[PDB]
Amino acid sequence: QVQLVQSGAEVKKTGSSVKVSCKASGYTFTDHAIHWVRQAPGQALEWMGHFSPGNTDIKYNDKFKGRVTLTVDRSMSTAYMELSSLRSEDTAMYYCKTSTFFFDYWGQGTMVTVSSASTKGPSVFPLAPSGGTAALGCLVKDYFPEPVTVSWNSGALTSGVHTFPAVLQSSGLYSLSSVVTVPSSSLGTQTYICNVNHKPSNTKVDKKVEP
Amino acid sequence: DIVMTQSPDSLAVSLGERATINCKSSQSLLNSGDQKNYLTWYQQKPGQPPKLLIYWASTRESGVPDRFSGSGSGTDFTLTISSLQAEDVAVYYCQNDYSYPLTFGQGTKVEIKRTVAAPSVFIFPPSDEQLKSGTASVVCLLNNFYPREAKVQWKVDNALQSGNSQESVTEQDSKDSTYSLSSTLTLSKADYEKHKVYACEVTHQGLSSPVTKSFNRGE
């Protein structure tokens, strides 16, 4: 089974550097070039360069040449992408992948967030219930970095749940709401608890939302 | 550098109907040595890496069904998806594989077109817990509507707000092809406690009249 496993998400301040790794397995490392492709939030794919491990052919997009360095550790079947003098434009998902179009395998992506924000778990506030349908929810405010996960009633409630994509606020912290619609006749009998997990800060909040 | 320009930027196609996505390159991608066009198509769903669909302009990747078809030559290429399915909702990219730097088109986002569906609107005042913090968030929810275009206006004591709200929209629901949207108005506690009537007014193609949901602070 061919696998490309990338290193975890990173937060860096502007001007810093980041080095992302890409561990290849399930094939002979020197059989394919490793390409690096990134994608800023909501934007198009962008090709950064490639490293061909068998013969050390390294090619860069001039947009990144001199700020990015591609290397490999052939002994560990690992490719690296180092990006220096980080800027706001560099907040993005970074992917490694094999070959051009002859061996379609991609790593799972590494999110690099360029920010001066400190890691912070969210404040969780109720969106209380005010046609037999009632809407309720949780406002998941002021956390950093991405991502958060939200479940309802420990995963027992999934129908009608909408957990919105996060927005970045002017504070540099993210915010989102998770909402669910339920029968009004259940409001007095069924407890509704949003389970908010923010793994970067190891925070877990279970907030009961009451009418 | 080869510039790759896709058209349209977004496409809404009914289930079972044909989607057509065009990709134009600023230079020919036809390789004299093998007479192949080095044009590649990828499918990318949110949160996932792209997936190879077609290469050499018209050769389908193994595992890709034959309702995906690539055509064209030189500078003008087309991806046709026949009998569109919900699992085809994605952003599609063409890529220049002819000469460095390898460059991508800007993407074409495909969604399912369905009959117009009006949003169900809900408003939520800020929680007492949040108010202790000096900032107040007021949330307006537009639930399960199509198409995605919608106008959400905040009114405070009937004054139209500007600059102090942010919107978030879901991806398309795979089973019913709808969107939901949140608009969040952020005020200082001082401003929140100064004013009384909080309203969000929603305009949408499915509504013959705009829908307003409102509350009076403290009720």
Residue numbers in the entry:
A (entry chain H): 1 to 130, 136 to 216
B (entry chain L): 1 to 219
From the paper:
Murine mAbs 5E5 and 2D9 have a similar specificity, both targeting Tn-MUC1 in the GSTAP region; 2D9 requires N-acetylgalactosamine (GalNAc) to be O-linked to both Ser and Thr in GSTAP, while 5E5 can bind GSTAP when it is only singly O-linked to GalNAc. MAb 5E5 has a relatively high affinity for Tn-MUC1 and has been observed to induce antibody-dependent cellular cytotoxicity. In order to reduce the immunogenicity of the murine 5E5 mAb while retaining specificity and binding affinity, humanized anti-Tn-MUC1 Abs were generated based on the murine 5E5 mAb. The 5E5 mAb was humanized from the original murine mAb specific for the immunodominant GSTAP glycopeptide epitope in the MUC1 tandem repeat by the mutation of surface residues on the framework regions of the variable domain dimer and the use of human subclass IgG1 and κ constant regions for the heavy and light chains, respectively.
The structure of the humanized Fab from murine monoclonal antibody 5E5 specific for tumor antigen Tn-MUC1 has been determined to 1.57 Å resolution. Despite undertaking thousands of crystallization trials of the humanized 5E5 (h-5E5) Fab in the presence of either the singly or doubly glycosylated peptide antigens corresponding to Tn-MUC1, the Fab is only observed unliganded in the crystal. Interestingly, the single Fab molecule in the asymmetric unit of space group C2 is observed packed head-to-head with a symmetry-related Fab across a crystallo­graphic twofold axis such that a polypeptide loop from the light chain of each Fab is observed to insert into the antigen-binding pocket of the symmetry-related Fab. The conformations of the complementarity-determining regions (CDRs) of the combining site on the h-5E5 Fab do not differ significantly from those reported for liganded murine scFv at 3.0 Å resolution. The domain shift of h-5E5 from the parent murine Fvs is about 1.33 Å, which is about double the average domain shift observed among the six molecules of the murine 5E5. The humanization process has imposed changes in the framework regions of the Fv which may have affected the Vh–Vl interface. While the affinity of the murine 5E5 has previously been reported as KD = 1.7 nM for the 24-mer Tn-MUC1 peptide PPAHGVT*SAPDTRPAPGS*T*APPAH prepared by in vitro glycosylation of a synthetic 24-mer MUC1 peptide, the KD of the h-5E5 Fab for the shorter doubly glycosylated glycopeptide antigens PAPGS*T*AP and APGS*T*AP was measured here as only 41 and 61 µM, respectively.
